[PDB]
Amino acid sequence: CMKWDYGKMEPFRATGDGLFIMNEGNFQYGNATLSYYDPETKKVENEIFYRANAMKLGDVAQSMIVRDTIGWVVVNNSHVIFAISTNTFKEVGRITGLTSPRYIHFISDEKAYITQIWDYRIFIVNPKTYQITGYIECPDMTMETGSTEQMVQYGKYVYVNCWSYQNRILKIDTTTDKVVDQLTVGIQPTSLVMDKNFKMWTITDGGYKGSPYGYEEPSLYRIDAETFKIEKQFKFQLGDAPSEVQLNGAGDELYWINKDIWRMSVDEERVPVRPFLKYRDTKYYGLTVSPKNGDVYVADAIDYQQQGMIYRYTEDGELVDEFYVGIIPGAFCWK
């Protein structure tokens, strides 16, 4: 007639060139978890962080960056960024005292930018002393609807997009740590990526009818690197929610969900008609492209309250594998 809960550690010895899957988990449940997949032996380990540390990851894991043998897992709803080893999944440190961080971007060995939602500031941290050393103020940004998501750097500048309740991408000068110029796109640019010939690709969300900015046709853009301009814009027609336009290893080929998983090349023209994977009554939430061989992994969240499945497809489009992970697999990172 009693109750109890403890934890026990476990010696992981992961080797090979695996894939890290960040399961977001649900919201105000604290069931976010991390998973590891080995493409050679087709063996997947779930809850690697808790199993190797005897403590929960947090709430709403968002992304992860691998530098050398250290991976930085950013947790949104826990105000923390965990630093773990990519060979043992042991904790090497933590960055705490943030306000719902989204992404991290290392511009030098001694400096790093962190971007938040519900804030008008971009944090600056030292990846060694583990302390905040300043903030960057985005102009015309309010605490009520502040949002900055993804960073791509180009020479001395850093490019960000402003997703939630925003329609702007910002250019930051890393020498003076100031916003130097602005660009305007459609409502809610979700993700930002850079290709091999230096052209940023961003994709704009629709609006999910009712939002204060209202709805607008989801679009795709090809902003140039040196000079902004807008160069070219693509139209995706209403009723769609495209996102996650990340590239491949070579950085010359586009990939976005938009219902049917599409595949576009750089320095090409209007969207093709034949999808990479037409439709098989599945709810695709995220995807990634392997830089080694070119396999395409797509994540299926099912009903957002159970274990999701990832499908592994070759460059041709044939299924090779499928395996279970934590709840709502959100992002991928390569060891």
Partner: protein, 623 residues
Amino acid sequence: KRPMKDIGVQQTRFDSLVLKENIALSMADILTFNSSIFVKSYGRATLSTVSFRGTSASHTQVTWNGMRINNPMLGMTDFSMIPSYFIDDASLLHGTSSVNMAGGGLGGLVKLSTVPAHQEGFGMQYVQGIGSFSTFDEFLQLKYGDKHWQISTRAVYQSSPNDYKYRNHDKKENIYDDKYNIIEQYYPIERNRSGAYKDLHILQEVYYNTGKGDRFGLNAWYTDSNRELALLTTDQGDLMDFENRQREHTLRSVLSWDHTRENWKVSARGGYVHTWLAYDYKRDLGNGIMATMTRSRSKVNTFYGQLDGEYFFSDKLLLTAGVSAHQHLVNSLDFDKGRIELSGNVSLKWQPVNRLGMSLVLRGEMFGTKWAPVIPAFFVDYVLSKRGNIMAKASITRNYRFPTLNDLYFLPGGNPALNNESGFTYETGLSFSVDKDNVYTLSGSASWFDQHINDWIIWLPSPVNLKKVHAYGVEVQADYAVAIDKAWKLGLNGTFAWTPSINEGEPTSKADQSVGKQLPYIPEYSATLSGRLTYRSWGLLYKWCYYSERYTMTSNAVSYTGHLPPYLMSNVTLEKGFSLRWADLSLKGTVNNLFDEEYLSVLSRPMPGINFEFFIGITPKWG
């Protein structure tokens, strides 16, 4: 024996000493330890969700003095904001019995009311409670009566910081060195953060009785709530300058008129409720500026009217009818529109022979602009044996529940063209009572219910309907009261419920491991047991609650980070009463979490260890 109204009806009745046993108990705590209902609540002064017979919270209707209390936007009631001392009478209508009074009560109905007192002259009562964690409870009663008038006034104030210490098993604090390396990691002993709350409730009653068959009434209930939302277990850092707040101002009023005669009786009733909600989420940055990150306001106004009738053709035949109307004018700042709700019912009760008894209920509804199919209900009752009062019951119905106001009219996702859920139910059960010559009184019941839910409304990337759910099981309850000696009395009340909640929907996608699976946060088994021992002025009370394992995933898969163990809790209360000259003193001390469990009822929600509570009650005596 039974009244003609109670024919073939399965229900449980909360008597006065259950409700008036402690001033710190809300109706969430009453339902947790005194019924087989599952209550989802991660502590005290926090959101409480009632899952009744394997259904969701939206399928349970709550009526206070005949007026529905569920929030029209959300469709669910927070049971933690209803003090038990503000309720003088509570009943639980199970399944088909809810059709007797309400509409879309697919799970059931909770009937709350206030009863006129019988006080001659003026009297008053004051109760003060002191407990651990710096919690304070106060309750003041004022009343008066002169054989025509009955005026009463109550006030309840509760406040606490909620800074209890718990040992944290989900987080490890690391000890650094001169060069920022982890040397040792330990489980910290933290305190509950952002959990402070302050609640104020005021109730005013005015009752008049002509004595010629006309009785008038008026009740007003005011609520002032100021609660903070606690931090999760897996929340990192010494995060100060972070506040959550849910202010909630609400006024409930009901006007009642009863006109009775020889065989017929007509009751008219009207009411009005006003609600103001405010959610804040701020961060203190810089030096003194406190920026705001989330700000939500909402106002709800509802007007209620009802007219009931009842006619006795004879002692063995009865007719009832009634019309109800609700108008939820919602002006939620930051959509401003609402619904008109109409309900009518006609019922026939017939008692052809001494044993057999039949009842037929026909109900129709119209919410806003859409009518609903007629809801029928048939109840039959038979007496198997007069010796042990063995009685058999059965019922059947087809109930419909309308979508909530957010499922229809909401900013990010507002599908207007949404169907209403339907449910086909049939029940059967037995009962007994073996009262003996003032030695013991044993009574109980056991009922089987089988119920099918169709067109369940669920949000998944937005109403999408679907979610066929099969809910069935067995309910058992029993009461016992024996006098061991001429001064010792023992009472045992126990309930049990096996309630599988299986979803029969077609598998979405291809990897859906959810067909044939228990629904999330619904235990398969539940049990309660309450023991009371009385010796002169001494009283010992024992409360025990059991919940089976609650799954946090629709696939019921085994997970390290989503495991909720079965919930067992034990509470003990010892009370001593003294009789002074100008007042009556009642001293009682409550021990909650007697065995000091380090547990987790809701995922990542820390809960206190063993805690104490001490009450003082004064009741002046005059001429």
